[PDB]
């Protein structure tokens, strides 16, 4: 660790390029329109709330950055990729009132969206899809988002698809918020990785939201410590211009050491004293360090300011960063929370107006007005210049890419819709199916496979031969092989599901890994995902309760399904065939990025177990799509039922079809369903409609369209509510649920099948029990069946095992 | 970073105190029966799995730690934590078989435990309750885990709680696994707590499981750096004995040269290789070090090892570990990945019979036979006499705790219990409850109240002053602030709400954070609380949709609940008024602590909403424990209908049936769900047993025992689903069901209930929409219930906004 000095000594400092006094003008006319903005939200009295402090200690940092540094979205490239530290959206909106791009209306409708002309709390993208485009407020996610976005821009250059060579990555990160494990997990994946593309921008005003990240240490010292040691360039912004004349006269090097021996705590005491209990306390402390400011009055003392509040000292660092190749560089700015507020952190309003020069008047002060620079104005004259030579205004987004793509046709996709000669995986089928799509010309180069280390369970290699693995195995490989890190391996996913938005290069990326490890791990960027607009597939392969069956516990993937399903633009799906994932491959290709251009991801589990493929059911495409298709109706004269199954347990579910119309001449119609929770989103935009519209003749769920009356037995390798989802629209009284509730533990998948009681001996009882309660058979028989299938129904319910 | 070569040189080298010959003998066997082991589940052909390479390559660390330094629990304390890595439990189940722990045929019953007699595939303690303690099978888990468990026992002996100062946590990872981001996003934390009573011990073969973790790099040096940079005791632990003579007579320091240099990549092909080409390869570089092995054979440059292969420099890292106070440590130990196994890593296998001088006739090799010593002999006196210096055997778990608690009782909340003078939320009643049980003498000091920074917006100031903030607001402090951590926190409450166990110390964590930054945020935390049998209150704060009404999408929760729902463990409820919360905590700590000691933990979901908390219904108690108990019943002549209501939402629906009654004639029966979750799971355990047993009296689920068939409404500030899951069970023909479905945005909270549709007017108009299809009343009064009350029945379903 280095001395507690500005890492840039004065003397290698660059010029500042701007003019001082306008940009503070303008620097305040944000900071007051950021006040005002949540001070009149306040007013409402709606408890809307809205931040202003943190704002304040960095606006400086941020005006810096406006004004010499952010690339706006241009006909090159989509510009600095800037992830704002969300909190300070209200003087994001502020200054973007004043460039004209919101209206005062939008502004007095903050945190107010519900009818139109609102703004959102934070950076929301799904909310404003045309001004936001990272969502950050979730600590943490916003700097390993950025670590992978910068590696990914890397990524399309050195695969020829764009230049990206002047994007540069801005996190902009609180000192509290580096407490997070991924703010520090993910960093020496910068330095190995050689992002210098990547700035994490560090506001070390000391203050959490609670109090400090540290009292009694130096949470600068701890920062530089460890991301010196992950060989990150290090630019500590320590203090302001004032204070450079005492460092060149401490010929003793007392001053600097003061500095060092002086924790935290001192100073964050010194900011609420006075001038004099500062050159007590502190320079008051040895004889050489005292004479420094002898000549100074208690007024001049106490004019000494942190670096993160003097734009001389933040360009110097930005500058250097931008400069900086081979390595990432964080900037730790040293700030006051609360600054300029005083009282905080009308009088308090009067406060601030005289503390930032503000022009409004006190006639008008009362009404809490925002201030605006007419057109002709040198305020205004600046502010666009500055802009107009960044090549725009940020934060700004487009929703859709401009090129038409030739997406290929089901056709395309012929060999899976045949039944297979060699019994193969769903898992199998997807990477045939990635092939297909790895053979046409138009989206070839777009696909992006991504992987975490382990690509042999998942068949994967075949295509490391065919397009390589990305190692800057060389800069032109297609897949991206991120390790043990799912999250990252998820952050590279976003950053390629939106580079349609971000860079208007639609990008089509292919996750694939243990779905355990999917939703459950990551779920937070699951959900900035679909904040975000991501565009893409996530393959949760192994999945299933039973089917990887010898990892146990923490492996045993019953449930991504239920966590999929609370994702409203996550498109879900457990098809049991290679030909139902040929058909939702395509439909999502078609739906994401053809001419529909639909905002939704998809999420398709796959299995790692082999079986007999069979041929597709001509016309079962649309049912496939939406969710379910008769497979087939065996005929029985003795009672009808209907079966329901999906992903690995269809096959079961068809084995006990067979059981009940041999053994006991029960027929049934067989469904398919590739997915419970898309008939279940459809049965309730369904029964909304109908309850909204009461003159008008009912809507019926397309599964209620698909099934018909008879008892009816559904069983998946995931918990019974995936299944039972669907109840309210299943037309049948009778709908028993079979599924994978409880821990999952080794064993060979025929004893987990039993355990769970999710195998065809289970769906015979199930079906055998409802036809029973009907009347149409004996009780007894239900019971025999039982012992016959050697079925312990005293066993300890699985959930409870 | 310092010099590719021992931290320790052989003149600080301690000498080795046990029998290396002895030791030498005892491994050979270990490393013989983890492997017989993983073959012998291979050939049953089931996909069982399991690995070798990675035990094969950390054999000899793990001896020495279990020869002189693992101590196991003992009468002062649990003895030391292992961390020990989940792949390589083959070779613990080995240890544990020869020290006579483990008989034969649960060894050939690894990965089969469905029937009772087998070995989890990793450490689970659900699963194996006496053995396992801590789930690392999930990478990096294990290490944030480890940090924590370390914090927590030095907070134990600071507190007063227990003396832990003879304890040690050891974790134990592979290099691999560091890239995960929570293995070194929180290393910090062990040097601000200057946590000397941690080591990590990091197994760097160099490789993950699809191929080298950096090759072109050091991962090594990368870990030094970042361990070191944060403060960290780094001991490498390079070459072998051998190495030594060479580095000794090097006085040219090239061969140290020639290490730094060589990277990861280079290293490992040099393994796959022979002496030839490691004497023309490596020392061939340079002339230097070329003369250093002239006069060697080729055999003997061969011989030449890596560090973690050799006792003696094993030995001296961990005794240096010991003697190092004020921070952690941690250990960089060089192995070979697949080491002794030939080749890459029935008969072939006869090359490890070879290789570790396994006592096996050539002959028999083909039965896969085990090895054992016989008492008497040298080395099973040798292997218990090293264990008993280090009281017992490990690892080893004690599923109760021994001590009894004298809870506090019902009525000891009876405050809570009454009206509530002024309108608060469910939060502040949270607090209050905390209170409560800070006054019980006997569990006051085993509370360990936990935030995650914001606790101030959780109303937990008053706590602050009354048993302070732990800070070693001092190191008597109780509450435990980890900032903006929620996994850090997690992992706390993870350690808290484990010492009943580890150290047979109950504590009882109670853990409030913003609710979607819970299970979305830390979800794999909480699957492996389960695992881990964790014992506390995870308390949701902030909860609902349309109450966080401000924060908009990334806070607005309105699933978490859904995903508390996957675990088998959690009881998950979401209280409306102060006296459910008392009743719940109270039932919770029952349950938990009391004498039934179950093994589950509490999810609570709280509000941030104030309004009238009326007085708890005589008699409700234990509806509110089971998930849902009647409020009142409204008159009405024209029609009847059930509402249904949980959290915020509740009062919304009692507006409703008002309107309903005065309005429209309609009278209702109002219902607060305390537990949809519990609800739906006592419903499918229901339909389980009574599919099950099909002659027997059908249980009847406990929502049908409380509602009547009358059409019903639910309505609450979660998705559908939340409501929907008890669909099956309610016996109604018509039962509608209002949530928040859709991404959150900030507005009031009036505007978010209108827009998700849950509020008052929809819940009337839902219900009169029912009546109106059974021809209750017509069409048209409905139609203009739509138009009065201001509702859009043609604005885009929530979920697609
Ligand atoms: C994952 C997550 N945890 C907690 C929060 C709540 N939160 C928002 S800001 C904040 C503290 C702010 O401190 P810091 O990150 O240092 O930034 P500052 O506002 O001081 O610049 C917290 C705990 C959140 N939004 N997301
Ligand atoms: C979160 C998570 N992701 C992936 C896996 C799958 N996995 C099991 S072992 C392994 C590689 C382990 O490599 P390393 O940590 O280097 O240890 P080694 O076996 O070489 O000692 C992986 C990725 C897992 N268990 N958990
Ligand atoms: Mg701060
Ligand atoms: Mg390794």
Redo the contacts between chains.
Sequence with gaps: ISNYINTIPVEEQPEYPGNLELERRIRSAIRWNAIMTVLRASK?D?????HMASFQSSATIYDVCFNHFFRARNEQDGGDLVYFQGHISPGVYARAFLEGRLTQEQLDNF?????GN?????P?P??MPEFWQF?T????LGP?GAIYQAKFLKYLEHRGLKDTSKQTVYAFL?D??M????????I??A??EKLDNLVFVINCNLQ????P?????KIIN?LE???????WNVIKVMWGSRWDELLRKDTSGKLIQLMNETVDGDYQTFKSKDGAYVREHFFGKYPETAALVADWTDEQIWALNRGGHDPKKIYAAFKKAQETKGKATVILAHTIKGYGMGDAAMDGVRHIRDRFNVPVSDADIEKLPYITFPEGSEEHTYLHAQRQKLHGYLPSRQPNFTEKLELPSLQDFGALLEEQSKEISTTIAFVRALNVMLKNKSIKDRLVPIIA????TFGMEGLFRQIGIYSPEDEKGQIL????????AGCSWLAAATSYSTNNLPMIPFYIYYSM?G???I??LC??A??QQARGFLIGGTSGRTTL???????EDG?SH??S??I?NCISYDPAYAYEVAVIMHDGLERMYGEKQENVYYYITTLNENYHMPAMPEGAEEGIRKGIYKLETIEGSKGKVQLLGSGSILRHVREAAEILAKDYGVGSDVYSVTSFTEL??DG??C??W??????ETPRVPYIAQVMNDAPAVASTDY???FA??V??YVPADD???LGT???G?????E??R??F?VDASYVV??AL?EL?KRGEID??V??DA?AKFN?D??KV?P??A
């Design positions: 409402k709606l408890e809307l709330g809205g945190r107010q969206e519900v009818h609102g703004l959102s709390s934070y929301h799904k909310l969502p407020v979730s600590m943490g390993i609180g509290g918020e407490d997070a494990p991924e703010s520090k997990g993910a020496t994946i330095t190995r959490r939201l609670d109090g990240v540290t009292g009694n240490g701890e410590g460890i991301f010196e040691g992950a060989g280390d382990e690509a042999r092989q991120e390790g043990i890190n799912e999250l990252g490890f939703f459950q791990r779920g937070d959900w900035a679909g904040d069956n010898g990892e146990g516990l923490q492996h449930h239920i966590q399903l609370t409203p279940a989103r309730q935009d029964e909304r109908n309850m909204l519209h009461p003159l918990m019974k509510l039972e989802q109840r309210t709908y028993r649920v509730d409880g821990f533990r080794s064993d060979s998948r004893n987990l039993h355990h009681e009882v199930a029990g029973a009780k007894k239900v019971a039982i079925i129904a005293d319910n959930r409870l």
